[PDB]
Write a protein that binds this ligand. Sequence first.
Ligand SMILES: COc1ccc(C2(C(=O)O)CCOCC2)cc1
Length: 191
Amino acid sequence: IKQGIREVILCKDQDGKIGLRLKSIDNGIFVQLVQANSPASLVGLRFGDQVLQINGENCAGWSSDKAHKVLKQAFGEKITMTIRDRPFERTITMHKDSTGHVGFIFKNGKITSIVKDSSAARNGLLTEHNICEINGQNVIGLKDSQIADILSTSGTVVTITIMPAFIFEHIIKRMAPSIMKSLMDHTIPEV
Ligand SMILES: COc1ccc(C2(C(=O)O)CCOCC2)cc1
């Protein structure tokens, strides 16, 4: 999680898309969706990012509709944005035990139990928190079984990005679970 305000420069694809849906939260604008292999993904926009400006206009108090409107009108050639990185999220680094567990239980992405004397317990993992990312890979909308698989196929060191469940549930309001499963970018980021 980068701790300040960064600039990104986007270019609409051939179809006039940038691969983004935005959501009004708390009189700010936040990324709700980033499409796989989109301009948004390529420049490193992530679920939960806060859009502070689009082409030098403040996003404060915009509706989701106005934000999507503003992206439609923009000259495709070059869109600038100012971004706060995942400001509602935090990162937690854990170490797997000899049996391959970081030490928590979760249901529909939300951590529900912390196991006594686990890495999760020592690193202060919290319940009623939704898993957004595992080792920088977005897992939002993936089945519980696949999130377990991605945890099992990570090394002994597991970084998990988490969001308070209330906040997460407010952000994904009005996005179909199939769009999340199907289109939400879940690739290991390119270099
Ligand atoms: C007393 O507080 C702590 C905090 C972290 C740990 C480690 C972990 O499990 O993450 C131990 C193994 O290596 C990494 C760190 C241990 C004790």
